[model samples]
Target: DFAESVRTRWARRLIREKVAKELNILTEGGYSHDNLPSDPLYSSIEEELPPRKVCIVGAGVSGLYIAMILDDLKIPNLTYDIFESSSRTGGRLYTHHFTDAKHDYYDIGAMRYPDIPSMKRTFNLFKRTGMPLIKYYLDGENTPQLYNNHFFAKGVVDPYMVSVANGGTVPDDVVDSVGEKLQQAFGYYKEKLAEDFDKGFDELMLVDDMTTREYLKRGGPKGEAPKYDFFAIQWMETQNTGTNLFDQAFSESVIDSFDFDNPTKPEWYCIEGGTSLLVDAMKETLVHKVQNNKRVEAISIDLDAPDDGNMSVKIGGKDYSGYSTVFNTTALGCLDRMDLRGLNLHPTQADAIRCLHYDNSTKVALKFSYPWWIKDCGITCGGAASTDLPLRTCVYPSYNLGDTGEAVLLASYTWSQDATRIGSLVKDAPPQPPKEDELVELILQNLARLHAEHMTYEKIKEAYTGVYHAYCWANDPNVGGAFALFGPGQFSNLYPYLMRPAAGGKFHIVGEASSVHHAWIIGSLESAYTAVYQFLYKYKMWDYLRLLLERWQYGLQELETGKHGTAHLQFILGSLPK
Candidate 1:
């Protein structure tokens, strides 16, 4: 039985690895959260109204956290393995180690997790497991890099302004020096935001909800602000977020997702060392339950066997039995492998999976023997008035002053070219990738432009000597794209369709895409907790039963009273309809 389970798990992992190698160019984008699934596949036989068993598919963050919750609730389930991807667990939360610099740690995957409510729960889960929390990022005590504007200025304005505005809310010592007017403009928004209190309001994210342009125009000083200054201010306010007023209805509830009173420009936070510490702790505790190197092939109901009969699975190359439930932690696209012969699932779920979109996101780590800013002298977090950096948004130096302090830089690359379709559409398209030298050259050029203001591109490129390392999550086959972003009406349609419990009541799902507040690492944990909480409360069965009974009771009453039932109705009167 164990071998069979292992086989099936192996088959599934193989299937994923094999498919991921395809490199579906257009649809793939951004971070591993896009469509990436982890391993160990925490398949447990616990927490269902029907007292079911499970077969978890992946060992990613969701799978591990889900298993942790099941373990806490005394839920007994066996884990399956598809591949031996990594020695320790943390899913996409990868921390890189390098030898060139003093502090060698680099986070190549997830950036950070805010200390919000759900995230707090995730941390508590780690603490109870007896793991040490990571307190520094990039092994550094102090090193802040100035963000460049390689004509990438349009994107940074909103973020920079928001950061300045929010900083003003605290005390003078806390906020960045964005001048009194910018601060005042943001402060006005802050006050307006705080005014709308517990008075519940819905529909916050709309196409025209709250753009930087609108916020500045409505609240900021009128004509007194220069025309370029106004445009610059507006541009600064809305760079990083995926949605703008033109895209959605702009509801206030949208802002609430950030755990901020005004979501337009929220504060940022990160765990010590990196957030992967929590995931690492989970992996250590689940070592015995973890299996690697096997992939899941297909999951279907055994019609030959009755409900009371055996539930079978053939993974790798062997048939396995003993699980009454299967918990799937992968994306909806993977459900194509499931045998969906009998269930009448809504068409939307199918469409959502079929139509879900993602973008290419790359993170470039440049390890320099010296701080680029110190010798350059022109480098500081502050820069000139113009904003224009193609690859520039923000930069944080990766070094621990307390440790063997050397200078390592973790620079992120986002806002890539439009990525909405699939791979190499034009016949015989040439393989195109940014060459290392070219990128280094671009970085140098951008740095000079930001610093010198008058330096020519040729001169800037000549002195560029930094070597860089980077990976593209989006455009990669395994992770189809970055986190899912709700466009227009697509928000309400995502969860119910793709995030339901798997057949046999065994497999469940979790991840950033599974949650409404997707994108961040916290969203991943929340999605996991959703499945885990369901198991602990045994709520799924009740929720299902409640729906069934409500329909039944009402239907029976209608039948008894000789009236029309909702499911099937006759619109005729007793006295003979006309």
Candidate 2:
């Protein structure tokens, strides 16, 4: 077994080892296109062959999108069977509407999306579904910041106050210039990326085993190893995100800056009603084979010697058979509990599924009688109110920027440890939470603290309609965590094996966790595209494969700069034995 620090070297070894053997065979055999049928020949063979059926385990965006594409492919006698554990569709793309009136709700799962080149597939899904988009102002005008009992109207950080609170732990010279220092450290790799893509990623990968804090401490222009100290980093971490979020991989931190914190960042958007509209639109447009309330118990694959393989899925007590491929789209945590001994995964791949690090998220939205944050506190333009308080962040609804109706305040939004603390106050279920008085009290107290200049605790308490919903993704049995948050070397160590096809290329894993762009719907969508592509290639349904390629963009070419990684695609193609 290789050490965590040597995962890059291991990957390099695998790439060269694979390139010569399997790759040469694909090229030598008329581009591996001779035996694969197309057009009129495909029609005759397709008529003689038995009907093809596939099984999709989850009804998340990835599974749903796969069903849509496979159904659209219109391969003669092919059909897809989709099973959703819950009674509802749109697995994580859930939105909670309190009153069903105009703009009286909050999204529980995926709320916002950025329109960028890397996220083109998401916008394409949006356009295909005709989902309306509205401007999402994050850290924008009228947004307030509250930290260490001090407040700023348009604040990124209050280093002076931090210095006062921490005594001498914060450097005197770094009193008001924390942002500049951070920009300098992050810019080093960005500059390297612009000049040479692979070389920049290679240099960046050197720090794969280091946490963000460790990287920041040594990330200087000329070999300075103590760039920032503990208290100062603590000050940034607590105010910026929850405590200890920067403890994640430094590579993930740099990639976050590349994707979200660009100098020329594009406009970010949210759906008009809620993100639920997108899910609703997808359901309306698809020729679906969805079976809700069908929980998957176990999956075991049986391979017949030469060419045939069938996957048997046990839903409750009934056994489902005759699947050409079974796509498991659930999160890794959920996947671990299933009976996967039949597929015979590598020990390393099994460990990746069992121990992948994921972050927790908790969201609390209160239905208020009026738009208090906007009307009273002058927080007019929609954005977030950040604080060191337990609330962490309060989101003002962008959908109802100028409305008199009852408004929903995302009173508390948090991730990591902060989310765990807040989630302790929340009930276990979601969308239809039973009751939460303690949760309500906590949010109101923090809301009062966050907007102390304009409103008092008593007023804020009464303004709430006594109706609230709080959800913790970790507590929900549907999915164990919010998103796949890579720790230290996980991105390099686990991602490739998670994407490898098992059970003779018939049992595939595809989801946001398997993709490079974690924590984004685009990742889920793009990963699904790769799975469909792999399935088409495996069956040698060349004409249907051509049709599938025409309808989607897999974002493979863009991964040269590591915009999004499809190294799994290459490895799986190498997986095709001659």
Candidate 3:
């Protein structure tokens, strides 16, 4: 019995190590476009390539980034056209300025971005484009920003203040006996996953098919039921979008926990002016190529066309042909709705396109007569407070805190059940969203509860500016959902098929969803790079492609080994052909 137990432990450890290594490679460092092998006609085809006419669908971050990289590479004989359905360029990176306020604006889409080594490509764009960035948290150079977490669960309400100064802790009696254990469990697993991927692999994998709520119930720290109430706040914070923790895949959630939920990686920032500025800069360079209000209805291809590169696409009932290649940066659901009769997709790929889940969210921004929260509540800086009320999260403005003029607060940023409820209100499009007054009243009722001590509906009504804006991503006509989310075996089963080219190598997909780092601007850029690199490789743009790939490989090697000695550097320099 002792021998059997020992052998079983050894076998488990070995399997864990192998699985962890594979997951790390897939999710973290190993995957890149450069590693893909070159095609047979890579050499000659590159030398004699024509000025290929390419069509790009959607003017989102992915589309713009593709054009940026292509221009930088100066791919031999390359010119392209960009078709945008909307009048504006920045798809989900939407920012809107108050009609009354000049400099103040609110980002309805992506707000805060974490500054980390993994997000190299995104930072590169900021540096290259000269787009300004401001520290997102109001408190200067602190750990996590000071934020109020008011729990309205179980009819009992209390304020749980957390920040860089005090670690997120609740007072005894107010806290559930094991609520802290849930938090400790989060930290422990986060550390284990990040430190040695293989060490805790088995324990983590057990929750792969489970939901976060299920995992916490079964494997989480034991305590009174109220402990789980506080756990709800942490649950909402994990991914913090349309999907609830109960709906998310345990394995996917665990993987995300290693990055998104990890408290150690907590430096966040935002764009100085607006997030749209960077996309605008990209568009400026390719102004002549981009055509606005061009809604692509269908995409077809002529497999027999000259040079095996003719794509026939439809826009507004008209069939436009003679394109060498077509790149789609649109949402997969949007693509699923389009007519792709000629583009024969694999069964798995088609299913994945139609079936993949996307997160939905609703953000309502309300402009106030003045910064009342700051003046009355002593909350100074941009941070958010959570609530069990329908309002969900109330995000304060990170910029222009001291100005005596009017300010905007993200009055209600809701996800999960709240989002679905709000989204249902605006489901029909003839009128679009509900009346401004109706939404404002509904939001303020909960907002008042969140700040019952100092704020009230009467006070809000007195100082309130009537101006407000709300957007429900799930209900939007252009974008059906906010971001992509994989459930259980969905990602593992479908991602490989989705990555391949369609329509006889004339069409490729690039977007945040297509990337491993879903719901981030960096993911969009990375996906663009991968798709374009694949396109170039397929056509055999060998010389420049080879140089670029080698440089990328060298960088990857440096990242992997963490060695920066002159001898190793000299060897790398010496090894490259002159």
Candidate 4:
């Protein structure tokens, strides 16, 4: 036993050395194609295989991307069917619309995205589908009061306000000067962390144990952290993504900050019509293959079946059989509800399915008679305002600029603690969501307090049209939560185990939760890419598979920096034996 333990320790050290050496070369080469051969490395083995049927459990971004890739590859041999529980596509890429308006929509889910090179997969999909993209911002960069609202306490002077409450606002120059300083200070910590990415790579496991907040306190430049507005910083750390900074692994924070804060990146964008249009575009290619409203209740895999492998899924109590491969793209929490007793899933895998924490989120959208924030309050939408109220966020519309027509305000966008409070208000609401009247009333009251000088309960009441709706993702029957949020030590504990295939690769899981890029569509695409590649590998289609992999791997050559520690994790995973 002692000899075996010694041998295992030595093997582990060798693995680390081999990985560090290879990663060192890749980083030192600066992600140049010269280091990676331009020619197809595996074109020699051009063997054709029999066609196969694939079962995709969800028609969301992850599953859709897998279908998109197979199409892109023009793999005529592989046919697929997408079974979606909901009547609509774009699971979390949801966009709510107004009855009377055209081209006007409220993105209750993922709205804005960073236009970084690492997110090229998503941008490439947008480019390929010719999906229109638009820069997302409420107001000009020179505007004062970050996000167009005054900061805290019941009664306080609006820094950008005039002589008295009734007077008009100050000039652009004053606003610009103040806004510039705040913006610089706001990005100070992020900028410092990105600097480290340029320095070189570090072992991800070393920093995986700390939380974002803890790391930030100890990880500032020259051992001095930047001064940030407590509320704003807290919101910045936790609210934007599903995971809170206090709960998220420090390594994730470092990588995400490094990726998002890079000065070279273009920063933000949104789908022109709506984010749903991206899914709609992908679905157009697989229109005949997708089957909506088919909720999966059970999945069982028979390894010793007559035809080598078989997967039978019970949807609507009827067994859908003869599927050799199945990809379950449903949310982990939702997937946990399925009967997988026959799969012989590892205990750790089952635990990951049941134990993964998902962030609870609620979005209250209010369509008004006019663009109140723009016309009445001079706040356009450079960013959203933060508050301690139950409403949490007063997000101004990024589109419909300079138009006095009807508009929508994401009146309340809350996550974490704030989300919990709002969710509690509607806990008793089943069969139907919380009363729109009550939610709208509460939001208006909170908004009145946040924007006291320009907005009042009376003003909001008069302007708020009868058209209002609120949806809590946590309450959705098909989707139990918004997105996966890994807490401290959770990433190191379960992520590796979750990535492995179950039931001899017949039962596979793929989604944003399966990748490091949580809460982003790009993560889903990457997860899909990895899963499909793994499937091909398992099927012994190495020649054509390797060629296809090269085409995709070439994209990573543009990854100039390895600041994202998750990439390091990928390298470690890659080094492991198949």
Candidate 5:
């Protein structure tokens, strides 16, 4: 009941104050909303527009944005999605109105999006979509005991350590040394790629060629304690590489830069009510324009079906013929063997989309009645929580649910292939709780001790059993993986290929992963804009041609001595103003 009381108080604080405070910026402040970056291009060629009919699949934020932009261009479009849940459409941004908990909602999925530059788009979209952001300085203020594992062999990663050729052991004081090195590295390369056409994408691709391990091995940390350097080196091998870092595309200097110098980056941030709130607001705008239950099974374009481009879509056991295009926005695996029998997409479209790949990742979310043992053990910062467990990383979506403290969602990362559970693949995968409760218990037990109180055995059991929802991404059929992180050498190839436009101007694929800024929210939105620009730039020849004629007409007025243009002018006149 004490936990219930705390939650009730928190909920009241959220609904009565935080919600109203955040909405004031747009509602009463008279903010000017910007149309997407492609607006100017759309305005130039409205009259000679071809018969544009687009069918956007999946009603997620990305899919919805595409349709929204197309609608802005006055292009006829249809959007569809398969929302398994009965709620109005926010996949993964699920808020469970829990029966057992006193506070009403539990974030079932679609948790926080960090406020890194990589996440600018997702953050911006959230801001625009009426989802408020809550910023917290949860660094815990130089609490030193938390440094034990990271500095000691128990938690040290060798990537940062500088060792003798064969038999060197990592020394103590590794954390400070690693921090300094990371800071120096960032300062060195922060703006080096500033003017690159795709700085974000290029970096991800650049980093992909080397595993973090291999990258660090080459640069070898140079700090007060080279043992710390050795630790940094070995740690990178253990930590970030997740795969084979030694074999990846990362440059050696990039490793020393990030790890040895200064790893002090801004902490993190999340949207209130989960990021799905942002997705929901975008979907709201699509209410009449989108169909909710249409789980598109197949898509076929019929070049033979003259005029309004012949295409048929199978959904819900019924086939519908539409005067538009069906965009395949589902994951690569779902669309790979799709029955696109009749759709005659141009060759450009086929080639661009042919080699698309999906990554494998697993994430789990657990709900607890209280701050639990981690806080008790005096461990609030996630990095120090549990290095041995895959579920080691912890994030606080602080104030995201407004003041509702009814639940906390803990996510753990894993290689998708390593994930073994029922709900890992296919949206239809049955639900399964975390396979290890004992580890969770240990983490919580230690946490309780930190808070100067031992959690009763019964309390720990209750909290552990209360996981509202969880999913193993390695097996998730819908996602294939959580999001993409390029394999070594895969960055350069995949980055450009995925973002390229398909068809003469038929299909456009976009997402955060499609962004050159790989794995960032900003890159995601930027790519969305990129797709829009490509669509207009490739197809708006009539508008460009008109401008060209205007230039020619003016040129003729200033022709040679006789006030007449050259033979080329005569030919252009013959070609145009015909």
Candidate 6:
């Protein structure tokens, strides 16, 4: 209904979608046959704009990057304040260290990264912050698999090896190549996405609006089925990806697949210490101190201030004003609870914030007395061992591979439904951890079952040191969900309103939720960079914008026609009073 409603309007849906599409609509008007908004916010940038102070909410990467940029530029007149509601920095970029030993840690949030074009900015940030990075082995030899209560340590994990015919619900051939079916089902767009992102994007847009299950059944291109049955679809979910992912948008799956199974495979990398160290690198560069534990009670328009004061936000029950623009990096769910009436947000913008979804994620890491999985089993390369157990996936640390002493293991990492139920076993820790006697026992049991060939339950139990830490992102109050994952029709329908300017063009919503690369750090970084560009563009601060573009060595094409940062300029323009 909503897609058709939006289709009622026109933008020549033929040309293909690009990260530059939105930018083209705003600057290169020849690209899209659409009109800019008639709202006062889109007023000409040539006129002298007001001198401004910025308010940054949430000391996450997005917020901190804004401060770091301002610091680098040495904006003579620009004044800003960064307020973090939580006591910690690096919002979701957290890492849990088991002990003081180097590389003896697992990232609880945002662990590994693929060095792809889309992820360039993230890698640039790693270098920019002077953080050293190490290679992360995504998959390699000795990566084990366990299914249907049977373990397979051999590289080729075929369902037939575990006897896929157990249920009679699956086809004989399907069991032999569960992965082949996935390629058949989704690779149509994967090919196009790589050939030409623009045209490939059009195909993705046409991808039927439904859960992965529905798409595999009938939500194909113009009703041609993916030729997968219910049983096969369920099998695909179990073997291929994270739990509960089959229920997410099929289009979302296409983009995710392109990144993972891309034709131009990339070398994956991660910080040696942990991703949290990157946060520290960013924090050290900031001139403004992140005022921690200062929860923002409300953000309102300060109508009563001198000379039509900028935006107003209540911190610690006290109102602070004189901010020309506020860059909001708080989670969408958190923003929903804030008193936003003063921003005079469009009804659609207001709803989009609360209506979009953020998927759940849970991670449990344990300190091992020895790297038995490596020394004995030879799972020396960094990769995951997936299983049907509640633990879902077990990850071996890429760092400290040869070190025979105590090492850390990402015992279990799950998303969606698996994450939902696993939360029961993990209690709120951190203060960093509280001993979960039962959770440890359950993890050992699952590990033993998965690696029955390599290690026994008693052996696995003996290797694990008593020290462990667990976290369910959804359980955390500061952020309500793990990452922004839109539902069936959300990508096209609701995603734009989240990007449109709010609070009289003085307040901009930013973070991964506003990015196409939602689950990764690049999303937050790009969105922040884009918001900074938008604010400067709004005030006609071309001089400042140019200086930043040059200092960062960013081509105008990157910020102007770039993919993630300046996205949705047209999202704002399209929402104009048509």
TM-score top scorer = 2
- In angstroms, the error of model 3 at 377 is 0.9
Kindly report which residue stretches of model 1 are placed more than 4 angstroms away from their true locations once superposed: 1-53, 76-89, 100-102, 129-238, 241-249, 256-258, 262-277, 287-289, 307-321, 332-344, 374-387, 398-406, 416-436, 453-467, 502-507, 536-578
For all candidates, what are the clash counts?
A: 92, 0, 0, 5, 75, 0
Q: List ranges where model 6 is wrong by over 4 Å.
A: 1-51, 153-167, 190-204, 260-264, 303-308, 429-436, 553-578
Q: Judged by lDDT relative to the true structure, which candidate is superior, 5 or 6?
A: 6
Rate residue 176 of model 3 by lDDT. Answer: 37
Q: What is the full ranking by lDDT, best candidate first?
A: 2, 6, 4, 3, 5, 1
What would the TM-score be for candidate 5 when compared with the true structure? 0.62
- Angstrom error of the Cα, residue 512, model 2: value is 0.4
Q: How much is the lDDT of residue 195 in candidate 6?
A: 69
Better of 2 and 3 by lDDT: 2
TM-score against native, each model: 0.60, 0.87, 0.77, 0.76, 0.62, 0.86
Q: Using lDDT, give the best candidate's number.
A: 2
RMSD of each: 15.1, 6.3, 9.7, 9.3, 15.1, 5.8
**Cα lDDT tens digits for candidate 4, 222-337:** 33444333333443443243335556775555445445433534657888778888877889986346799999999987756756347788999999987767899999988899
**Each prediction's whole-model lDDT (CA):** 0.42, 0.73, 0.63, 0.64, 0.43, 0.72
Q: What TM-score would you give candidate 4 relative to the actual structure?
A: 0.76
Q: What value does the lDDT take at residue 501 in candidate 6?
A: 64
lDDT: the better of candidates 3 and 5 = 3
lDDT (tens digit, per residue) of candidate 2 on 1-578: 11111223323332333333444555673322112212222332266545888899998899988888887787877778899998988888999988789898899999888776667788888888888898897755567777668776345444336674456456655656656666666677666655765666667777767788778777632333347777667755665664244777776666666554433457889999888888777767667657899988889877554434477799888999888888999998888988888777767778989888888999999888899888898988887888888989888888888887588888888998889999998865433543446777778888888888899999987788878888889988889879888788787677666666777678788899987766889878877887787787568776776777677754442221111223434445535532
Candidate 1 weakest ten by summed lDDT: 566-575
For candidate 6, the per-residue lDDT at 298 reads: 87
Question: What 10-residue stretch in candidate 5 is worst by lDDT?
Answer: 554-563
